[PDB]
Amino acid sequence: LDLILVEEYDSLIEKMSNWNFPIFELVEKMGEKSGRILSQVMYTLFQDTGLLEIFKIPTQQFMNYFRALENGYRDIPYHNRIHATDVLHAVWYLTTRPVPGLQQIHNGGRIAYISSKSCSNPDESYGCLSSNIPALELMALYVAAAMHDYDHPGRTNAFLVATNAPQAVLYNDRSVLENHHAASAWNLYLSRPEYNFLLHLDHVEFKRFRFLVIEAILATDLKKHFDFLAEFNAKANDVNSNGIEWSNENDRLLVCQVCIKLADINGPAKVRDLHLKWTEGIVNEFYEQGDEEANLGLPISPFMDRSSPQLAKLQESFITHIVGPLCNSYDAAGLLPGQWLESRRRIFCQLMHHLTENHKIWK
Amino acid sequence: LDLILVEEYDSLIEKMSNWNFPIFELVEKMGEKSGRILSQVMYTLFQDTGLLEIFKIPTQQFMNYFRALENGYRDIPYHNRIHATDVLHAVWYLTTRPVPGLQQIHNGGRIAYISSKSCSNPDESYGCLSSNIPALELMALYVAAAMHDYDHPGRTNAFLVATNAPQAVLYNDRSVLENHHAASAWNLYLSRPEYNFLLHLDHVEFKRFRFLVIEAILATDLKKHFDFLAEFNAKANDVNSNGIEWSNENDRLLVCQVCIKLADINGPAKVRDLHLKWTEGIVNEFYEQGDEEANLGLPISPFMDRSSPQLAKLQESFITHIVGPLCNSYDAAGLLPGQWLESRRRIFCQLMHHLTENHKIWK
Ligand SMILES: C[C@@H]1CC(=O)NN=C1c1ccc(NC2=C(Cc3cccc(I)c3)C(=O)CCC2)cc1
Ligand SMILES: C[C@@H]1CC(=O)NN=C1c1ccc(NC2=C(Cc3cccc(I)c3)C(=O)CCC2)cc1
Ligand SMILES: [Mg+2]
Ligand SMILES: [Mg+2]
Numbered sequence: 044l045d046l047i048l049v050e051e052y053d054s055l056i057e058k059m060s061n062w063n064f065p066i067f068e069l070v071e072k073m074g075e076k077s078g079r080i081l082s083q084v085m086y087t088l089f090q091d092t093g094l095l096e097i098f099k100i101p102t103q104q105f106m107n108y109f110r111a112l113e114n115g116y117r118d119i120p121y122h123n124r125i126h127a128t129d130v131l132h133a134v135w136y137l138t139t140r141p142v143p144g145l146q147q148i149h150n151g152g153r154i155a156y157i158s159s160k161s162c163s164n165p166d167e168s169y170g171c172l173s174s175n176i177p178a179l180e181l182m183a184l185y186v187a188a189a190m191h192d193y194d195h196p197g198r199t200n201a202f203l204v205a206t207n208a209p210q211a212v213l214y215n216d217r218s219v220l221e222n223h224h225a226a227s228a229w230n231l232y233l234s235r236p237e238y239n240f241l242l243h244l245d246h247v248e249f250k251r252f253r254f255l256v257i258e259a260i261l262a263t264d265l266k267k268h269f270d271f272l273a274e275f276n277a278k279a280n281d282v283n284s285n286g287i288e289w290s291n292e293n294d295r296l297l298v299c300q301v302c303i304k305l306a307d308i309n310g311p312a313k314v315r316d317l318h319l320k321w322t323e324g325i326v327n328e329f330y331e332q333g334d335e336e337a338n339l340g341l342p343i344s345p346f347m348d349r350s351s352p353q354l355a356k357l358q359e360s361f362i363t364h365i366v367g368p369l370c371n372s373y374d375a376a377g378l379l380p381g382q383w384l385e386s387r388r389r390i391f392c393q394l395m396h397h398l399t400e401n402h403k404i405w406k
Numbered sequence: 407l408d409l410i411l412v413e414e415y416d417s418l419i420e421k422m423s424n425w426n427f428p429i430f431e432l433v434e435k436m437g438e439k440s441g442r443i444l445s446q447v448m449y450t451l452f453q454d455t456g457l458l459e460i461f462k463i464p465t466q467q468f469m470n471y472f473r474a475l476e477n478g479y480r481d482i483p484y485h486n487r488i489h490a491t492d493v494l495h496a497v498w499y500l501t502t503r504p505v506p507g508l509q510q511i512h513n514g515g516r517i518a519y520i521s522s523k524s525c526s527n528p529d530e531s532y533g534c535l536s537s538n539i540p541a542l543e544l545m546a547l548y549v550a551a552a553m554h555d556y557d558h559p560g561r562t563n564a565f566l567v568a569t570n571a572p573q574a575v576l577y578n579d580r581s582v583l584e585n586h587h588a589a590s591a592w593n594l595y596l597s598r599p600e601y602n603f604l605l606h607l608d609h610v611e612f613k614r615f616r617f618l619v620i621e622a623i624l625a626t627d628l629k630k631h632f633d634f635l636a637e638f639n640a641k642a643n644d645v646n647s648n649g650i651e652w653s654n655e656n657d658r659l660l661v662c663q664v665c666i667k668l669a670d671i672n673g674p675a676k677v678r679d680l681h682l683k684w685t686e687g688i689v690n691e692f693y694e695q696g697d698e699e700a701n702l703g704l705p706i707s708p709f710m711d712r713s714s715p716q717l718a719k720l721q722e723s724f725i726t727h728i729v730g731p732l733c734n735s736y737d738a739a740g741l742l743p744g745q746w747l748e749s750r751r752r753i754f755c756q757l758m759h760h761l762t763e764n765h766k767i768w769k
């Protein structure tokens with residue numbers, strides 16, 4: 044409302060500048076307009092990174108699409124607009140904040156690079172992925188986060204598969220959910236001219252962007268979790284490996300894929316209060332799949348029977364086997380944003396500590 | 407009351423026992439009932455192998471389903487019912503006839519194996535894949551040959567992706583056609599109970615069968631050709647390896663996938679008369695696609711311009727870069743059914759001869 048448009052932006056930016064962004068408060072603060080949280084956060088971020096400028100993105104069609112995408116998220120405990128916004132905030136944060144030791148290459152026809160206005164590298168001893176990953180590719184990453192769980196039913200792929208859901212048959216049982224999120228969101232994008240916010244990309248650019256978004260969204264199928272980790276590890280952490288070549292297209296993508304994977308399951312690397320909040324969501328969603336499995340005569344899957352819960356086993360397990368090694372690898376590659384110390388170690392990494400702390404709760 | 411049945415059977419079997427099975431003569435002989443050529447061939451091969459007996463397959467539902475499958479193939483010049491019958495004939499043949507040097511591991515438990523009634527290994531110096539690959543797996547391979555190009559539109563994946571066809575968007579530009587052939591054919595199968603010829607397989611066997619059929623059909627996407635060839639040459643044709651491990655599920659599957667890939671593009675490895683009949687079909691199909699491309703103001707694809715043909719370059723290239731290396735690769739593995747001349751020392755393989763000869767036509 045004139046001068047309130049700026050106060051709203053500057054404040055949100057202020058709150059999001061935190062890894063432990065108090066996202067639920069924002070939800071509470073939006074009140075009856077909390078259903079527009081994903082589109083609102085998108086606008087703010089594409090503006091923080093200068094993406095609207097770089098690709099001459101028209102505001103109207105940009106908001107039309109993301110407003111329509113939002114309403115595509117179901118009202119379920121975990122895989123909703125809020126989780127999508129959460130994942131978006133994570134990748135935006137992980138690709139723009141200072142990282143100790145990271146080597147730079149190029150900041151700002153030619154290949155454009157973004158740069159967050161809400162943060163900067165303290166000195167030449169830091170670096171950010173945004174100086175090594177072109178704008179288009181990071182834009183693809185942000186967009187993929189927004190669409191990555193679009194129209195999620197609150198059920199797993201094995202559930203869909205085991206019950207011969209039409210969606211599973213349609214996708215031959217492969218990454219059923221992930222294929223549907225990507226196909227539906229792109230279907231949505233191409234269904235109306237008023238959504239065409241990428242109209243200024245040339246045909247080659249648009250085609251590559253579509254490919255990237257799809258590649259990030261499919262990377263979120265946990266079934267391929269171990270193949271992805273192996274690859275990434277082989278590229279930067281394993282001995283012999285030359286490391287990540289930032290000038291190599293496939294290396295960038297892989298990094299980005301790993302980045303959205305970490306963001307997608309970020310809960311345990313957040314402050315306890317946030318962690319316990321996302322924990323409650325996934326278990327409530329599981330119980331719902333369990334009630335349906337039982338009603339269908341099927342055996343209740345492990346961790347989904349409310350009358351026989353194993354909440355600590357779930358978090359202990361899932362952290363030890365999936366989240367942990369993943370953050371471990373990303374961190375061992377020197378990509379986690381953090382700060383120099385000069386405790387006993389020279390670098391303090393906030394998520395690494397949250398992860399450890401939250402792990403004691405359940406171990 | 408039913409004598410004119412066995413005459414047919416013994417006839418067709420006699421004719422199919424030949425690599426250069428005169429499939430076009432059979433289309434003629436069937437006259438008006440030729441539209442049911444695939445279902446009829448399926449039944450004949452399932453008797454020949456004993457799959458009907460092994461899996462207690464009820465004739466009624468079996469014929470119902472494969473008659474429905476057949477009518478799903480469009481009336482186009484190459485990717486039709488006949489082509490599917492051709493591929494079907496080729497996987498059965500590659501899998502049942504004598505292979506020089508192939509150890510007769512399963513020379514006769516709980517796991518069933520099929521045996522073609524129309525042939526046998528003259529002796530110990532011969533073998534056959536039907537003895538190293540379980541009945542359930544070969545059955546999946548045959549059923550996939552049956553369904554592999556179901557509801558093919560006579561257009562390429564590239565064309566689909568470019569015109570942004572709904573199916574292209576629905577599958578995220580990944581093996582569009584192949585995913586659709588498999589998804590449509592399983593949807594059909596499940597749409598009605600009178601199609602359930604597999605009702606005597608347990609949910610475990612059926613689930614695995616489904617997986618194998620999908621794996622085989624998706625393996626026919628030429629986009630993944632060099633990957634399969636490479637992944638194959640590793641496990642079967644290179645360094646410090648004694649080759650395949652018939653005991654290994656994955657190795658078995660890779661063998662099956664290369665077998666259906668060969669059968670899928672078998673034309674140039676058949677006798678000159680068969681080779682040219684298939685060549686004619688593929689060129690007319692490319693021309694129909696090229697007309698639509700021009701009509702849409704799109705650039706006409708290579709080899710698809712009927713006003714500026716390159717028929718010889720097409721065949722010479724495709725044999726040199728695709729068919730050829732796939733066979734040489736399959737041969738070095740030693741899986742080709744052939745014959746020693748004069749046994750041991752050397753082996754005469756009919757398909758390699760045809761291939762070399764047909765190449766001379768265009769080079
Ligand atoms: C990251 C979130 C939030 C949090 O703080 N804690 N826990 C979380 C969380 C916990 C479990 C899962 N698991 C998911 C599973 C895999 C899985 C299911 C049960 C046990 C384990 I072992 C792994 C699937 O295949 C489909 C939906 C995602 C996903 C997220
Ligand atoms: C095996 C058949 C029958 C025969 O006897 N000769 N030729 C055959 C034949 C020739 C070419 C193709 N090509 C197909 C192409 C790839 C391709 C297209 C143009 C040049 C080359 I280089 C390769 C696609 O991506 C989609 C449909 C299948 C398919 C079959
Ligand atoms: Mg998901
Ligand atoms: Mg998610």
Ligand SMILES: [Mg+2]
Pocket residue numbers: 334337338
């Ligand atoms: Mg109930």
Ligand SMILES: [Mg+2]
Pocket residue numbers: 554555583626
């Ligand atoms: Mg095909």
Ligand SMILES: [Mg+2]
Pocket residue numbers: 485489493554555626670
């Ligand atoms: Mg085919």
